[PDB]
Amino acid sequence: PREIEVSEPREVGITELVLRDAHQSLMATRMAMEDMVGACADIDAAGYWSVECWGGATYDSCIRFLNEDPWERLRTFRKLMPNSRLQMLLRGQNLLGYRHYNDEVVDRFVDKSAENGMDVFRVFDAMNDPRNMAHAMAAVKKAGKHAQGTICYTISPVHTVEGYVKLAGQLLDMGADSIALKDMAALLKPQPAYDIIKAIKDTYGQKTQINLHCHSTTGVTEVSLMKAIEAGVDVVDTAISSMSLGPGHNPTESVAEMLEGTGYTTNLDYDRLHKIRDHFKAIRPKYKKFESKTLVDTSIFKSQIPGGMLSNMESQLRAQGAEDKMDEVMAEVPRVRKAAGFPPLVTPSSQIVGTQAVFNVMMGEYKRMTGEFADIMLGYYGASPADRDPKVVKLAEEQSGKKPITQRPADLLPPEWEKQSKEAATLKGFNGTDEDVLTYALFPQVAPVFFEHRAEGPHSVALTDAQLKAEA
Amino acid sequence: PREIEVSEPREVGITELVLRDAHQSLMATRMAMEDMVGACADIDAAGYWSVECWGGATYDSCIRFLNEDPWERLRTFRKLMPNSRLQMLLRGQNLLGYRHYNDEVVDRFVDKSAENGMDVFRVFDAMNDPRNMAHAMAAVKKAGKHAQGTICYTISPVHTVEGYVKLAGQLLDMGADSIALKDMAALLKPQPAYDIIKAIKDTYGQKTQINLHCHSTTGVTEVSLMKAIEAGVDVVDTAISSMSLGPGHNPTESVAEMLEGTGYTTNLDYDRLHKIRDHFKAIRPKYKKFESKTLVDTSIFKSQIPGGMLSNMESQLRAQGAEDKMDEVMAEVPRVRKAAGFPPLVTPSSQIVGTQAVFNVMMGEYKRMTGEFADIMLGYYGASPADRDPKVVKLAEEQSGKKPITQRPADLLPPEWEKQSKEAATLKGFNGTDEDVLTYALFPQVAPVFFEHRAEGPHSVALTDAQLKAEA
Ligand SMILES: [Co+2]
Ligand SMILES: [Co+2]
Missing domain, CATH: 3.20.20.70 (Aldolase class I)
Known part of the structure; x- marks a missing residue:
């Protein structure tokens, strides 16, 4: 006892x-x-x-x-x-x-x-x-x-x-x-x-x-x-x-x-x-x-891969043709994660690592790196929990042309509020508030459509009672 | 600490x-x-x-x-x-x-x-x-x-x-x-x-x-x-x-x-x-x-009623007409359970107590008792965790005509194997084994149909892949 x-x-x-x-x-x-x-x-x-x-x-x-x-x-x-x-x-x-x-x-x-x-x-x-x-x-x-x-x-x-x-x-x-x-x-x-x-x-x-x-x-x-x-x-x-x-x-x-x-x-x-x-x-x-469709999944304790990341890579392997390499992509995730300094596999790091893993299995190891993966390796997302692989860092710099950084990324960003405000003010529907400028700054590609339709009021994409009852 | x-x-x-x-x-x-x-x-x-x-x-x-x-x-x-x-x-x-x-x-x-x-x-x-x-x-x-x-x-x-x-x-x-x-x-x-x-x-x-x-x-x-x-x-x-x-x-x-x-x-x-x-x-x-359709239900900690018992009584209240008395039937369950000596609410005790609860709310308190409830009150299912209500016991005896017992029920049961064996041996399909006699003794009303169709082999009542895919 x-x-x-x-x-x-x-x-x-x-x-x-x-x-x-x-x-x-x-x-x-x-x-x-x-x-x-x-x-x-x-x-x-x-x-x-x-x-x-x-x-x-x-x-x-x-x-x-x-x-x-x-x-x-x-x-x-x-x-x-x-x-x-x-x-x-x-x-x-x-x-x-x-x-x-x-x-x-x-x-x-x-x-x-x-x-x-x-x-x-x-x-x-x-x-x-x-x-x-x-x-x-x-x-x-x-x-x-x-x-x-x-x-x-x-x-x-x-x-x-x-x-x-x-x-x-x-x-x-x-x-x-x-x-x-x-x-x-x-x-x-x-x-x-x-x-x-x-x-x-x-x-x-x-x-x-x-x-x-x-x-x-x-x-x-x-x-x-x-x-x-x-x-x-x-x-x-x-x-x-x-x-x-x-x-x-x-x-x-x-x-x-x-x-x-x-x-x-x-x-x-x-x-x-x-x-x-x-x-x-x-x-x-x-x-x-x-x-x-899954209530319990404990496979992550062995594979380090969250089900949301797993199925996502699976779709990339089929739409790519060779999905019989899924077992190979899963063995690659750990290697890519390690190269990136072992970041936690949460959004967006998970999608980024998963994609790069699929690329390595397809066109070879780091032959083609996504722009996002290159940014992680070069420090544009910040520091990793552990040191990133210098060999892979070098490759990222030679493919992006960007120099590696180690300081907080926002230190390099110039003022942008005035620029965001002016561009937002040109969209039909813009209501002039800082809240709307923020919406434009956060989602530039959606803000235009949203501002034009917002007046219709919020909608629902859920089934209606009629559709629900109609399915039964 | x-x-x-x-x-x-x-x-x-x-x-x-x-x-x-x-x-x-x-x-x-x-x-x-x-x-x-x-x-x-x-x-x-x-x-x-x-x-x-x-x-x-x-x-x-x-x-x-x-x-x-x-x-x-x-x-x-x-x-x-x-x-x-x-x-x-x-x-x-x-x-x-x-x-x-x-x-x-x-x-x-x-x-x-x-x-x-x-x-x-x-x-x-x-x-x-x-x-x-x-x-x-x-x-x-x-x-x-x-x-x-x-x-x-x-x-x-x-x-x-x-x-x-x-x-x-x-x-x-x-x-x-x-x-x-x-x-x-x-x-x-x-x-x-x-x-x-x-x-x-x-x-x-x-x-x-x-x-x-x-x-x-x-x-x-x-x-x-x-x-x-x-x-x-x-x-x-x-x-x-x-x-x-x-x-x-x-x-x-x-x-x-x-x-x-x-x-x-x-x-x-x-x-x-x-x-x-x-x-x-x-x-x-x-x-x-x-x-x-329910993954988690904690209401039982307050009501003492298991969801399987709850929905079951609900069906009895609608098919009976007055379902607006559900809240009354739920307050009755505890009273019936207590009268029966607080047995655990597991099958078959739950269905029995739930039914008697619905009856009390409908035709009045113990006005009409099911044969099963009467048997519990008279001891034909054995002893209860606590003493049963003497008042309700008396009513059960006056409605069933059976005298209350307190000893193990099987003490009163006569040998029945020979009787079961002879009756089973008259059903088409009976294979003569003690296993088949047991099937007849355990499920007298199903054994006849089963023995006649068993030769067709086991079937499934689940959707087939075709039906599953046809639903999607
Ligand atoms: Co959360
Ligand atoms: Co169980």
Whole structure:
């Protein structure tokens, strides 16, 4: 017999993800505002620490598929849930866009987000480079909001508990009000969850607020949440049960109920949770055309490849002809990842590494490198967790003609707000607000079409009751 | 800071449920033998402690829907998995049938099961009355096989840790080689799992073998499995990941992977598991017409009513007309359950209590009692966990004309083997074996039709590839 030290009896906070990450992960971010507003009053009174409802891929989805202004959605959520802490996911210097922006664009985006109601900003970087998060977080502090620095969890030869403890320290040094451990691929197992949370708390103090964000893709993370709570985690992210599991998240009600008698508890109102659950249970069937077909996939623990990346490369192998080389492409991913400095395999790094892996198997090793892969190797996306392969770096410079850099990429970007503002002002439909200039700066190719059709009002791409009933 | 005592580092055994409980729970027990045999070689070499592949509702499904002889399925499994411990679920004195049988029928069934290859017999009773399990377990010991006495876990005012420890002792006293904690409704939370397993081990010794069987219906039991392992559980039941979650069970691969670095481990071969997973992933879509629509339901923690029982009563309220009394029927279930002595709400007790609850709301309190409810109240199903309501008992006697009993029901049953054998021998198709007489004794109304069509060979009720592709 042995013993395990566990935290003192206490309340654990819960962050609800149904309005953002749950539908992004389970139904391609297609959830229409019309299908969510009806649950806002109950969500607002359920007792959550925060409600994630903006950022991530929802900005793109609003203007590209739902003809909806993302800023109007944020204003509506602020109005319908006046007593809640609203939370968003922001990818640092890239904001919600496709590239790094000059510091002034980051300042304006954060300022308008805060002005329109955002309370908690979860700032992250796909390569875990703190320098890419530094300016956005300073802007959040300037706005007087809560800055949550994020650490993307991954498994690799260079990622260790000591490495995560070091990263947490760098985030606290740049003003983070809290630290978020983000496990998008559900790779965080129970013992590592306990060990990392405990090491951060022991090193920086019990006052260090840590929020754990785990998906349920591999089926092991609800046990990780329990171990994280024993290690002292302050808040855990979950999704209402009718919109949970699979590539999504662990169920809110299940996480609350499992704590009975352990000394830990949540302050969630079960009656409100039941109403929220029933609300989405009635709406989810309309999104069947966008659902995934796998509830549990643990293959990543061996292959390091997330199912979303795997099927993606598979489509590239068929449309290319030789798909009988899938087993070869999978053995190549680890090699490419290593060459790139072992970055976490989350969007967009995953698509980039996967594509380069397919190219190496097709036209030979680094014979043809995508422009994005070349940029990673040359440092235009920031620093990697480990040193990149000098041999491959050299090849990237000889194919791109760009010189390798090691300093924060945005240091080289010139002011661009005036240029963005002038170009945006020439599009039919532009309403003159900084919000619209931001939409143009973030999605130049979609902004034109959106501005022209926005007046029609938001639409839904979900099946109608008639179509649903017509299918049965 | 506090501490929790956990068991010493050790290997935890795993029982695979894909061949029996997984499809019984997820696709109405309709899995065709043709769709399972292809995975037997891999299952046999995966390293499981046992493979559940018989008993439960599969006997009924074979002869009622698949025109398959259950004894041929058992023989086939024995031949294709020669190195594995085969396991079945047997409902004590009721065997796999609809009523209590005379001791001689129980003796013959167990003898033929053992003769045809069964290794582990999980014997249980829906009301947790050990007397109804006693004879079947003696028959298992006579056959030299492994007798696993079962405790059905439930939550009620009269169920306590001390009560379960007492039951475990009674099972060990009647020769149990191991104790199974069966949680069909997924009501077992983490702390209770730890407390009960620890109390049994502390009271009867670390040598006491305990197997935990939890469904994943409420979404909290994988954490319960982890706590049960910390408390010292010897074996846990799981289902291959492509046939898991929902009303089913926690994923085999997820349970094995979550233990990395905790000091606990399993001896499962991940490559074999991957092959089994892929096998069923390709077959499951063909059974879509029999799938359920809810992955997680925690309402039972408040209502004591399992979703399978809830929807069932709902159908009775509509086909009856007044379904606007559903909220009244749900408040009645607890009252009826209490009157019956708080039996666990598992089949068949659940359907019985649910029906009587609907009757009380319709024609008044116990105005009209079903014959089955009357039998429970009068003791013809055995003793209840708590004392039954004398007032309701009296009413049952005045409506059935039967006198209340308190001794084991089978004590009153006369020899019946010769009578069963003669009647069975008059049916066209009867092959003269004791196995066929057992089929007739267990399912008198289906045996005639089955014996006449068995020669056509087993069929499948799943969609064909053509029908599947035709639907897409
Ligand atoms: Co996420
Ligand atoms: Co079961």
